[PDB]
């Protein structure tokens, strides 16, 4: 039996909010080259990953999984989780991507690398979509946890699905509380979950680019990033 199930909706929300990782800074610049671009992003992503792992252990239900299953989910979900985080904190900066408070970028910079622009634009559209939907932090942390649990669960059991159910209940509870009708609730739920399909797509396209970058030696990537990456080859 899992403690996660027994949590009320507010308790789940409060737990997820309390689990939130901090917003990290990049090195302290512009203009940018491909190497220095990927240098900053790789450095930043690497430090973000350490916090993500400690965040994931605080997502209710995650501690109950075997070490192997935890590893698998994080291996599958990590770029998706970095991306939804990036999109969330970029909301308030239309047309921009707030990678860090001291690293706020637009499309022009995205030329910097090969394939960055296409992903850049997809990320911006997602951000805009979140903004136009007025996504709330409480909804955001539910979505991010769903990504963690969902993304790898078909590539493995019922525990994960009951926890996912609990988070669905929690999203609906949030919407009911915000005043939405029954129809508006189901509609918004669907809209949010469909965006997850697009986040998956961005991550897939992102991941094969990180692969090719491994396969030049464009930049040094950490052992940690390498083994997260290698799980997708």
């Amino acid at each position: 039996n899992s403690l996660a199930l027994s949590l009320t909706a507010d308790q789940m929300v409060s737990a997820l909010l309390d689990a939130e990782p901090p917003i990290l800074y990049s090195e302290y610049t512009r203009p940018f080259s491909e190497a220095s671009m990927m240098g900053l992003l790789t450095n930043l992503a690497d430090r973000e990953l350490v916090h993500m792992i400690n965040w994931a252990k605080r997502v209710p239900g995650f501690v109950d999984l075997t070490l192997h299953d935890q590893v698998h989910l994080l291996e599958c979900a990590w770029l998706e989780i970095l991306m939804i985080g990036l999109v969330w904190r970029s909301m308030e900066h239309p047309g921009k991507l707030l990678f860090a408070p001291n690293l706020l970028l637009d499309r022009n910079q995205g030329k910097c690398v090969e394939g960055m622009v296409e992903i850049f634009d997809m990320l911006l559209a997602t951000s805009s979509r979140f903004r136009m939907m007025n996504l709330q932090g409480e909804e955001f942390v539910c979505l991010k946890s769903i990504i963690l649990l969902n993304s790898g669960v078909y590539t493995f059991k019922d525990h994960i699905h009951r926890v996912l159910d609990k988070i669905t209940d929690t999203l609906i509870h949030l919407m009911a509380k915000a005043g939405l009708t029954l129809q508006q609730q189901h509609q918004r739920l669907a809209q949010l979950l469909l965006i997850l399909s697009h986040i998956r797509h961005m991550s897939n396209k992102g991941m094969e680019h990180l692969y090719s970058m491994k396969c030049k030696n464009v930049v040094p990537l950490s052992d940690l990033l390498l083994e997260m990456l290698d799980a997708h080859r």
Binding site: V50, I53, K57, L67, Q70, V71, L74, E75, D223, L224, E227, M228
Partner: peptide, 10 residues
């Protein structure tokens, strides 16, 4: 094995 294992236990 993997860094990820170390990080998840610690």
């Amino acid at each position: 094995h993997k860094i990820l294992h170390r990080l998840l236990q610690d």
